[PDB]
């Protein structure tokens, strides 16, 4: 999944709007799916207290 995953939080209603500028060369497409905040962990730290 050559990709770059980005997660954007969703308040429990309505819509949302992401992303600023960039380059966009060799772009292949998008893949979108909603997850739950409780289920999704934080992998950037040795331990996730939350």
């Amino acid at each position: 999944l050559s990709a770059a995953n980005m997660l954007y939080p969703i308040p429990p209603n309505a819509t949302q709007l992401p992303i600023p500028s960039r380059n966009w060369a060799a772009f292949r497409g998008w893949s979108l799916t909603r997850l739950k905040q409780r289920e999704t962990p934080a992998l950037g730290s040795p331990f996730d207290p939350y």
Binding site: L1, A4, M6, P9, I10, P11, W30, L32
Partner: peptide, 8 residues
């Protein structure tokens, strides 16, 4: 509360 997981 949930989060979006769009992946480019």
């Amino acid at each position: 509360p949930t989060l979006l997981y769009v992946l480019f």
